[PDB]
Amino acid sequence: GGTILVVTGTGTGVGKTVVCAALASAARQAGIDVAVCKPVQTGTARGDDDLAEVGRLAGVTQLAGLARYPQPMAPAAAAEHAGMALPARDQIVRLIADLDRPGRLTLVEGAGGLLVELAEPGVTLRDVAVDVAAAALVVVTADLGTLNHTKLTLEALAAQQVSCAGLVIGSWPDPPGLVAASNRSALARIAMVRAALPAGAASLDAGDFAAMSAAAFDRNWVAGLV
Amino acid sequence: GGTILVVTGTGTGVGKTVVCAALASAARQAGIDVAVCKPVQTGTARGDDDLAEVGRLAGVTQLAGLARYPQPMAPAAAAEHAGMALPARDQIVRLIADLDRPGRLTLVEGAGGLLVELAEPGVTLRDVAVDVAAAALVVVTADLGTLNHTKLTLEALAAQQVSCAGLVIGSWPDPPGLVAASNRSALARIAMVRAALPAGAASLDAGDFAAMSAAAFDRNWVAGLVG
Numbered sequence: 001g002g003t004i005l006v007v008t009g010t011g012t013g014v015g016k017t018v019v020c021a022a023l024a025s026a027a028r029q030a031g032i033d034v035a036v037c038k039p040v041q042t043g044t045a046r047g048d049d050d051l052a053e054v055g056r057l058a059g060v061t062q063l064a065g066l067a068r069y070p071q072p073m074a075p076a077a078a079a080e081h082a083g084m085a086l087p088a089r090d091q092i093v094r095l096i097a098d099l100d101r102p103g104r105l106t107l108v109e110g111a112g113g114l115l116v117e118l119a120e121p122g123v124t125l126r127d128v129a130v131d132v133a134a135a136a137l138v139v140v141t142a143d144l145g146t147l148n149h150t151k152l153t154l155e156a157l158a159a160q161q162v163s164c165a166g167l168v169i170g171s172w173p174d175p176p177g178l179v180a181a182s183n184r185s186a187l188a189r190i191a192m193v194r195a196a197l198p199a200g201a202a203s204l205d206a207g208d209f210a211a212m213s214a215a216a217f218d219r220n221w222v223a224g225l226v
Numbered sequence: 227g228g229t230i231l232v233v234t235g236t237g238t239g240v241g242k243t244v245v246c247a248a249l250a251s252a253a254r255q256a257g258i259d260v261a262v263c264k265p266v267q268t269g270t271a272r273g274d275d276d277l278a279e280v281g282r283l284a285g286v287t288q289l290a291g292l293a294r295y296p297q298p299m300a301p302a303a304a305a306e307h308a309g310m311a312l313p314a315r316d317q318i319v320r321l322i323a324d325l326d327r328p329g330r331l332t333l334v335e336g337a338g339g340l341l342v343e344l345a346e347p348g349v350t351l352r353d354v355a356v357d358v359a360a361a362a363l364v365v366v367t368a369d370l371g372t373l374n375h376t377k378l379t380l381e382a383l384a385a386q387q388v389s390c391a392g393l394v395i396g397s398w399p400d401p402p403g404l405v406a407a408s409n410r411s412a413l414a415r416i417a418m419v420r421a422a423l424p425a426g427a428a429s430l431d432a433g434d435f436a437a438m439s440a441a442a443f444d445r446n447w448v449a450g451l452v453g
């Protein structure tokens with residue numbers, strides 16, 4: 001096997017997907033092979049497609065998915081609305097373990113936060129991370145409330161002996177502001193901040209995104225991933 | 227003693243203060259004596275005073291505060307920015323125990339979500355809840371992401387054997403969209419949903435707010451909070 005990382009977040013819209021892309025771009029620039037798996041995608045009627053974003057921003061081609069629900073709802077809600085079950089636990093775990101290989105960094109993007117339902121019956125990204133021995137990268141905000149949400153997520157991680165690989169601030173505002181600046185230090189007191197991605201990066205072209213990503217993570221850590 | 231409920235939430239801004247007032251109002255109309263306590267209060271330089279707001283909506287006169295910081299930040303940050311310190315754990319617990327009394331419902335509103343630091347070192351409303359043997363009423367949203375936040379919070383409550391007294395949806399939109407309705411059902415499957423306060427409730431005057439409050443909760447549950 002190689003390195004499987006699950007990329008989770010304290011909530012939805014924290015920039016989990018752009019963090020996947022940024023880490024992918026960095027790791028690829030370290031000459032590491034990257035695959036990204038998004039098992040379940042919602043919001044497909046309006047063009048939600050997080051694996052496509054990873055393809056565009058980072059040029060990952062190993063992009064693996066199992067289900068697409070039109071509604072921009074939580075997966076189980078989208079499933080109920082669409083009239084179809086979620087994927088099975090086995091489908092998810094085995095698709096992921098089949099992507100994994102020596103030399104490869106495999107990022108797994110859930111939907112929303114850590115405890116949202118991803119497969120039948122009521123199994124979460126946390127469970128998946130356990131089944132494949134992956135660590136968790138926690139994408140966080142710099143906004144008021146991020147501390148509570150982070151401590152909650154790291155506690156849930158530890159409760160199932162899922163390791164915490166660090167935090168990434170999904171979107172670093174400009175100018176920061178007093179609350180965001182204070183939160184970045186506090187966040188650094190509970191886990192290793194790996195990067196803070198400038199707000200708006202999702203709009204860069206691939207060259208600029210690759211440059212951003214190269215400068216956002218510690219190169220030694222990234223290399224040290226696989 | 228009496229009954230102590232901590233009134234916590236899935237995050238900041240979810241409606242904790244308004245729930246304190248609404249449950250206080252319903253319990254008062256049931257003839258139950260209510261104290262509301264706000265040990266760590268931030269944002270005073272912006273006029274944030276949660277105790278005053280409970281008094282304004284519910285007429286609760288038995289309001290107890292302790293620490294007040296000017297900036298609208300996490301208490302640790304507001305304290306560091308004012309040149310002040312956070313209270314000690316036993317100061318907070320002392321404040322709560324002095325209110326407790328047979329026949330009284332004592333609501334304790336936190337600062338933000340359950341794991342915010344209230345006292346050094348890293349003392350939270352959960353530790354305080356264990357100290358005063360309270361149950362936790364968890365205020366949640368109907369918005370996308372609320373299931374995850376709710377489950378995380380309950381898991382953190384059960385981690386220390388702090389009992390969950392139920393959830394309250396702080397702000398319930400009328401009409402509820404697809405996302406709101408769905409979340410309300412799922413929340414009803416995770417824990418007892420005790421009330422779902424209508425959005426904008428802070429705009430109702432004394433009589434309308436008291437009507438809303440009594441209708442919001444199960445009469446039997448409110449009466450059952452205190453013997």
Ligand SMILES: Nc1ccn([C@@H]2O[C@H](COP(=O)(O)OP(=O)(O)OP(=O)(O)O)[C@@H](O)[C@H]2O)c(=O)n1
Pocket residue numbers: 009011012013014015016017018019050110111112113139170171172197198199200201202203
């Ligand atoms: N440094 C960043 C971080 C986020 N975004 C943008 O802010 C939004 C949130 O980021 P996204 O990665 O899509 O959200 P996720 O955390 O993956 O949440 P979910 O998959 O549940 O939608 C996106 O529209 C994205 O374009 C950005 O432009 N620059």
Ligand SMILES: Nc1ccn([C@@H]2O[C@H](COP(=O)(O)OP(=O)(O)OP(=O)(O)O)[C@@H](O)[C@H]2O)c(=O)n1
Pocket residue numbers: 235237238239240241242243244245276336337338396397398423424425426427428429
């Ligand atoms: N049913 C409700 C709930 C909230 N509000 C309003 O929405 C905002 C948030 O409600 P509040 O109780 O103050 O949120 P809190 O959880 O108390 O936020 P915090 O304690 O962190 O300040 C307030 O402006 C309040 O007037 C409302 O009108 N009707």
Ligand SMILES: [Mg+2]
Pocket residue numbers: 016017050109
């Ligand atoms: Mg995403």
Ligand SMILES: [Mg+2]
Pocket residue numbers: 241242243244276335
């Ligand atoms: Mg409040």
